[PDB]
Amino acid sequence: GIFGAIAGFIENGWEGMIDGWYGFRHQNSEGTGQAADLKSTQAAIDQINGKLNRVIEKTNEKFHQIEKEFSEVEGRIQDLEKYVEDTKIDLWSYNAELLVALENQHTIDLTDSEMNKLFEKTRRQLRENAEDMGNGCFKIYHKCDNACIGSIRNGTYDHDVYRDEALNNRFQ
Amino acid sequence: GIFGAIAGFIENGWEGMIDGWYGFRHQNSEGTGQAADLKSTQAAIDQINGKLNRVIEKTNEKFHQIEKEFSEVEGRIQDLEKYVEDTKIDLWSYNAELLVALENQHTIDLTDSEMNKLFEKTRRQLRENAEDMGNGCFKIYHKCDNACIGSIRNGTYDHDVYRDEALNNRFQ
Amino acid sequence: GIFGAIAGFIENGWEGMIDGWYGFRHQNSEGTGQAADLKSTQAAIDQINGKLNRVIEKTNEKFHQIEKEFSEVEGRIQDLEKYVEDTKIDLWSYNAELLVALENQHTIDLTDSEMNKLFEKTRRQLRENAEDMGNGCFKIYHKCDNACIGSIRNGTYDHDVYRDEALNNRFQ
Amino acid sequence: PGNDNSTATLCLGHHAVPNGTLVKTITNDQIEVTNATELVQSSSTGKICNNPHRILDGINCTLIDALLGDPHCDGFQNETWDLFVERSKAFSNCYPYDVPDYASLRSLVASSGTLEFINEGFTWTGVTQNGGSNACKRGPDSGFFSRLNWLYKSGSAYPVLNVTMPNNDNFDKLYIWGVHHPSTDQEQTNLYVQASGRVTVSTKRSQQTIIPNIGSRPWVRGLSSRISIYWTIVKPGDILVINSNGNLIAPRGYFKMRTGKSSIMRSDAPIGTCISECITPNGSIPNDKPFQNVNKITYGACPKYVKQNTLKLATGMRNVP
Amino acid sequence: PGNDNSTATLCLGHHAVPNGTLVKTITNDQIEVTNATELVQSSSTGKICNNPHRILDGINCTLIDALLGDPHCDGFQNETWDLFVERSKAFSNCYPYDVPDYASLRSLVASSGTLEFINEGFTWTGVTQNGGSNACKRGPDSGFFSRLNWLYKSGSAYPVLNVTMPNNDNFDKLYIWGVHHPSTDQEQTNLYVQASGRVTVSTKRSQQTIIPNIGSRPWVRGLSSRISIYWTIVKPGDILVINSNGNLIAPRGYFKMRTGKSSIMRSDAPIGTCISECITPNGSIPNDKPFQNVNKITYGACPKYVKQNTLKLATGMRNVP
Amino acid sequence: PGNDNSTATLCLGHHAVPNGTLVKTITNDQIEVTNATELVQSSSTGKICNNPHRILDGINCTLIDALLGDPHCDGFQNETWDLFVERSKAFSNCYPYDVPDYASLRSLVASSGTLEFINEGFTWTGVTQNGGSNACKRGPDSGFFSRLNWLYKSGSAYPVLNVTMPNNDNFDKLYIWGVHHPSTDQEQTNLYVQASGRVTVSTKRSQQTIIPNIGSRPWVRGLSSRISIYWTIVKPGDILVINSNGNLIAPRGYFKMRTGKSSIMRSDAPIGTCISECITPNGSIPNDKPFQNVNKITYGACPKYVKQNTLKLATGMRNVP
Ligand SMILES: *[C@@H]1O[C@H](CO)[C@@H](O[C@@H]2O[C@H](CO)[C@@H](O[C@@H]3O[C@H](CO)[C@@H](O)[C@H](O)[C@@H]3O)[C@H](O)[C@H]2NC(C)=O)[C@H](O)[C@H]1NC(C)=O
Ligand SMILES: *[C@@H]1O[C@H](CO)[C@@H](O[C@@H]2O[C@H](CO)[C@@H](O[C@@H]3O[C@H](CO)[C@@H](O)[C@H](O)[C@@H]3O)[C@H](O)[C@H]2NC(C)=O)[C@H](O)[C@H]1NC(C)=O
Ligand SMILES: *[C@@H]1O[C@H](CO)[C@@H](O[C@@H]2O[C@H](CO)[C@@H](O[C@@H]3O[C@H](CO)[C@@H](O)[C@H](O)[C@@H]3O)[C@H](O)[C@H]2NC(C)=O)[C@H](O)[C@H]1NC(C)=O
Ligand SMILES: *[C@@H]1O[C@H](CO)[C@@H](O[C@@H]2O[C@H](CO)[C@@H](O)[C@H](O)[C@H]2NC(C)=O)[C@H](O)[C@H]1NC(C)=O
Ligand SMILES: *[C@@H]1O[C@H](CO)[C@@H](O[C@@H]2O[C@H](CO)[C@@H](O)[C@H](O)[C@H]2NC(C)=O)[C@H](O)[C@H]1NC(C)=O
Ligand SMILES: *[C@@H]1O[C@H](CO)[C@@H](O[C@@H]2O[C@H](CO)[C@@H](O)[C@H](O)[C@H]2NC(C)=O)[C@H](O)[C@H]1NC(C)=O
Ligand SMILES: *[C@@H]1O[C@H](CO)[C@@H](O)[C@H](O)[C@H]1NC(C)=O
Ligand SMILES: *[C@@H]1O[C@H](CO)[C@@H](O)[C@H](O)[C@H]1NC(C)=O
Ligand SMILES: *[C@@H]1O[C@H](CO)[C@@H](O)[C@H](O)[C@H]1NC(C)=O
Ligand SMILES: *[C@H]1O[C@H](CO)[C@@H](O)[C@H](O)[C@H]1NC(C)=O
Ligand SMILES: *[C@H]1O[C@H](CO)[C@@H](O)[C@H](O)[C@H]1NC(C)=O
Ligand SMILES: *[C@H]1O[C@H](CO)[C@@H](O)[C@H](O)[C@H]1NC(C)=O
């Protein structure tokens, strides 16, 4: 029973993030906080809406076709009509099964990817001022108040400003 | 002809690992050693068994159908019966070809991924105590006996214990 | 309007690279330069030629089939002939649509992957002598003339030679 | 309490829900995602919406009885439809008949989409017209199919009938005609004099020729006799010839043929005052989903029939506690 | 010797085998993996396993000869089957016959799955029953199809035959009957008096009516004459009427119809004492694989036919030396 | 100017073009790539290349008129083809005729691939041979279908015709024959004496038997009479028997049947002096692409027909400015 330590995406999701799909949780001098990342959130949504527009890219319109139920036994021609239709249904049933499996694999992959993409982006910002804790979190080796964390989420963090302070905490 | 140096997954597999799909080889004060990683091994196997259960997700049962060979020339109706069947076979033949290609692409991708996933996991454990040699191996910048290597494979390696010793070897 | 700074693949392509698909741009004591990387270039091309050989893996030869246009109204049999053919076309039309979408997704993925693969390869060469600037470029923390950059592109860069000089520039 | 003032922790994460749902992938058979959507339509309202397709409810009539002009189907004269609906309660109540290749005539009429009928002035020299039967009551009087003309002896003979009707129009004409099969060799002569009639109906490139067959069939509405129904389509520029020795059940004109989106469906589903593009025998179904397992029989803009009753498309990431 | 005591090397790696196998991917046409499995079944045992489907070996008999009751097929009376097997050595040895739409009768009987036959007490007033022929020997005596009744003149006439048989049962009845075509205009009168017989077989909604044709056909088992075989299905609540002037080859009763999983296959493969769900004309094949290129003709739980003779599914990682 | 002499910048990058092209993916509906290629063939040259398939241009003749031997189609005697091309301008100019199941005869002849005809020495005792008609002029003289023999009365009678022709060959023989339908009951007796002819054509296992029908049809080239065309295939070891009372339009021999790659196509496209594997009614199309939306009707090694007019396959990376 450990409350207090925050943790990242490595084998845990955040039930408490209801204003976005991806985001940051921080712990610093001023306490803790949380903020969604709209950009990666929107990127996942756009991709998923696209598949779901293409999958629903409008039905086929069919009118007069062939009969598919029969009140009389007839032999050869009816056999063929039933076989044609059974063949069509099995092939479409296969198409549907495969489509869903492929699309769901892809949905999972692209959502995982957005997550990792946001991690790497953050890591690139931090340069030598932080280390990967291994749990989806960075240890930032300098005083980083709410405004500081904000600059990271905002993409305006200047690593040079804190570099001396951080290198000193990391090593010597 | 260089025997002595060990090497990692970067463009070489280990023919000598027969108790697992993925693993560690080490070289330290006590000599060399090798140990499979069951978890990533099991993860690849589970995924592959799943595809191979879904691909073999039981045959279609068909009974009375249409005739497909003919002893007499007949024209229009036979033409149609042959065309219906030729059409079905070509479509299923296509399905099979594509399925295998897609599934094999995926099998290769997920097995490569498990490999890289185990590398990154190890890298995260090591923090600042090791460097990526570029060949799938880490240079661990501190005395790491068999028990030490064991703690890495076991996931109980404490980077803090060795941090001072390693940072000193890496830099100053 | 900033000319002078060079930049990497992070959200920008190089219109000025006409002798390869992937490559290096550098800036050093001797000025700037650019060189294609043939290996990753060839790897993308080979993969794309493969798909484009398999997609064009030769047409199906068909001869006598069924009639598909009719000058007279006939009812049941013609209905079936039209339905058989409409069914075939819709299924192949679906196959084609899906194939192209899947293949194009894959083409994009494998080309992105080659890019990132060349970045990581370079990063592994550089060890502790460089830092990721975040824009697809490395800051190399030592004097690296044209010959030096060449050794990096050539895969013969010895990180040890420059390590002391670089660690000193990076930190102390 | 509180953490050191010298460092900070910044974690990256994704949302999760307490109510995840299981979907299928290539990798795994059951993986939990944050949200998903059904791709198989498996329910119907139970009603055939009468908008936007024109639905013609056959009620007590099959399309063929509406075509021939069975008296209780008189309300269908010259009717049109996108989809004709035949009900299981439908019944025939005219001269007992059969249609060799019933299904083809039903199909081609269904697809043509109209019973628009045009009277033509056939001259029938030497025979009596408008024969009626007690098995085809039209009020209290004996009667017959509205679109058919039961010809029989006049005075005491039945001259070889022999007439023509050119198609000088721009559309195909459909002619419905018949051959009468009396039950007794004594019924045959009594109506048509000759002991073995014939009906030859021809165009320039085609001909049908039918010989009647005397004999008793099962009693239907008082009768062991039958009529067999045939049809002939006459293209623009072509000519219809009708030659008969007897037993001819003559057409009174033609049905104008069309091409288009018209069809026919067997269903007992009530007609609904509502709007739906996709129609099944179960009733109309929505078409927002790409697939459906309601019925392989459909009409209009419909999801494709599949065997699965459910297919869940992930619309969110993997759900992880 | 040995490495420094100040550092260590820890390498990550994956296994590899000396016997890799080539598979196909999207990326590459031939990539070596550590292991793979065949998805196309391309071999058969060469035997049709008689378990778990009931296999009925026709031996010298086609299903139609078993149906009609060709004497050497008498052992098939009232037989049932999941899969009837017709052999290339089969032969007919009764009255020479043809079946217009042979394939449909063969199909519907195959699918019904039984030759369960019920005798009905047809009364045939004024004619002689049980005619026999030297072309259909039944021992040393002339004989005929067991399920058919060759009617002919009695005294010196052949009165218009006219009988009925209602279906007061819950199942469909299949009636098999025939029309005799004599070879000479003198054979016709000698058997049936009338010079041009007719056979009309009818229910309430359907009728078939056949006129014989006198003339010589190729000599078969002594004969230039033929019988043509027809059928009629009578639904519950409906009635069969049979009217004939002559040349009628009468049914002796009906075959009880069923629906189910029964079929028919042409094969010369021996029947095997073994177990297999999937049957092909080559013999039974295993069904562990999703596909097969043994035969497009199959029965039971089978892999799907495809044109490829091999498809290798990777079941291991890329093999790298 | 210039950068510090203490460091260097090394950037990794990929090319981009100023003229990117949009393709479709799973992820996005329109993504710009550096280059792509069309997979749907949507154009034709407009000409049917006469290489490498043997193209036989029917010109004024349908395959059936070439088969029967309509005089203006005499140039097609014994012709062969990979693909027979029927033109919309084709016309008949012989005795007015119909073919019940025209489409099947046209199909089986098309697929057989030859009109190779062998004369057989049919003996026709007691009748007159080689009847000719003004509706089938052969020069200035009345004439008839080359492959057919119009038989009629000799002296003053028409004896029951009755002949045989065994197949002692290794191939199937196709026999084309006919039945004449006179327009008047007085035309019938005048040609054939009997008042109701018959034609029975039989092998050991099959028979067709046709009764003519007297009556007027629409005037065609002077005539209200018709001939109806039938066929019979005789397998090796089997025997053809032809029995007729009158109205027989007799074959003069058989057409040798083959199996192979031959077919027939309706097209008005000019024949081209060029080379193409794939043929459509629009003309030949290249087959470098996997798909095509030119025509669902094709012959030879062709791309598969699809509904899309364009499908762009990326052949380069994402294009980024
Ligand atoms: C769980 O996933 C489903 C997947 O579709 C989500 O349902 C969809 O939600 C969107 C947004 O509310 C709906 O789009 C909207 O449709 C209306 C209809 O006109 C339109 O006016 C709006 O502008 C917008 O495009 C969409 O229809 C709806 N789909 C279904 C099948 O209901 C759902 O939002 C997800 N749930 C959560 C909690 O995220
Ligand atoms: C090479 O790949 C094939 C891919 O299937 C592997 O073959 C499979 O091996 C497994 C494990 O031995 C078999 O599963 C077992 O089946 C029995 C049958 O009842 C069951 O009782 C066991 O509990 C287990 O589920 C599987 O049947 C077998 N598949 C085939 C087609 O033979 C094979 O192991 C791989 N080779 C190596 C060296 O890894
Ligand atoms: C844009 O993408 C298309 C995708 O195919 C590229 O077109 C292809 O270019 C290659 C190389 O020039 C062609 O291959 C060659 O074909 C000839 C034909 O015999 C052969 O002799 C050569 O050895 C080589 O294999 C290929 O045919 C051609 N495909 C098409 C459809 O034209 C094109 O190069 C790309 N454009 C750029 C600027 O990269
Ligand atoms: C729609 O109607 C069809 C039949 O018209 C229903 O399918 C039948 O379902 C019952 C009960 O499951 C089965 O006993 C029958 O065998 C089915 N018939 C056929 C032809 O498959 C179907 O269940 C109905 N669906 C809905 C949603 O009403
Ligand atoms: C199973 O039987 C079929 C035929 O019943 C075989 O297919 C034939 O194979 C031969 C030799 O390759 C060809 O000459 C024929 O053209 C094929 N016939 C057809 C209809 O395709 C098949 O090879 C047999 N397979 C096995 C495994 O026994
Ligand atoms: C090839 O020919 C076909 C017809 O033989 C053309 O298809 C027709 O196209 C016209 C104009 O678009 C339509 O009005 C017809 O309805 C189409 N007919 C059919 C049967 O679909 C086709 O456009 C031609 N294509 C080329 C490239 O010449
Ligand atoms: C349909 O027929 C029934 C009798 O079978 C009759 O009672 C009913 O009124 C008829 N419906 C209409 C609309 O005429
Ligand atoms: C099948 O017929 C042959 C003669 O053709 C006969 O010798 C054999 O005994 C028959 N088989 C059976 C089981 O009666
Ligand atoms: C085809 O027929 C027309 C008349 O319809 C004729 O003028 C033309 O010469 C004919 N073509 C050939 C090749 O005989
Ligand atoms: C139906 O339309 C035809 C075509 O004009 C017309 O002649 C006929 O009188 C109409 N009948 C009814 C009942 O409206
Ligand atoms: C076959 O079954 C029927 C139906 O009961 C029975 O009447 C008949 O006698 C049986 N015949 C044989 C040979 O078992
Ligand atoms: C066509 O071939 C047949 C078969 O040998 C031959 O008898 C006939 O004379 C040939 N006819 C022509 C016109 O070449």
Describe the structure.
The complex is a heterohexamer, with 3 copies of chain A (172 residues) and 3 copies of chain D (321 residues). Chain A is α+β, with helices and mostly antiparallel strands and 172 residues long. Chain A has one domain: Hemagglutinin Ectodomain, Chain B. In chain A, strand 4 and strand 5 form a beta hairpin. The longest helix of chain A has 51 residues. In chain A, helix 1 packs antiparallel against helix 2. In chain A, 52% of the residues lie in helices and 13% in strands. Chain D has a domain of 216 residues: Hemagglutinin (Ha1 Chain), Chain: A, domain 1 (Alpha-Beta Complex), CATH 3.90.209.20. Helix content of chain D is 8%, strand content 36%. Chain D has 3 helices and 29 strands. In chain D, strands 9, 10, 12, 15, 18, 20 and 21 form a 7-stranded mixed sheet that branches. The relative contact order of chain D is 0.23. Classes of the chains: A alpha+beta (172), D mainly beta (321). Chains A and D meet through strand 1, helix 1, strand 3, helix 2 and strand 5 of A and strand 1, helix 2, strand 22, strand 27 and strand 28 of D. A molecule of 3 linked components (NAG-NAG-BMA) binds next to loops of chain D. Chains D, E, F: This is Hemagglutinin HA1 chain.
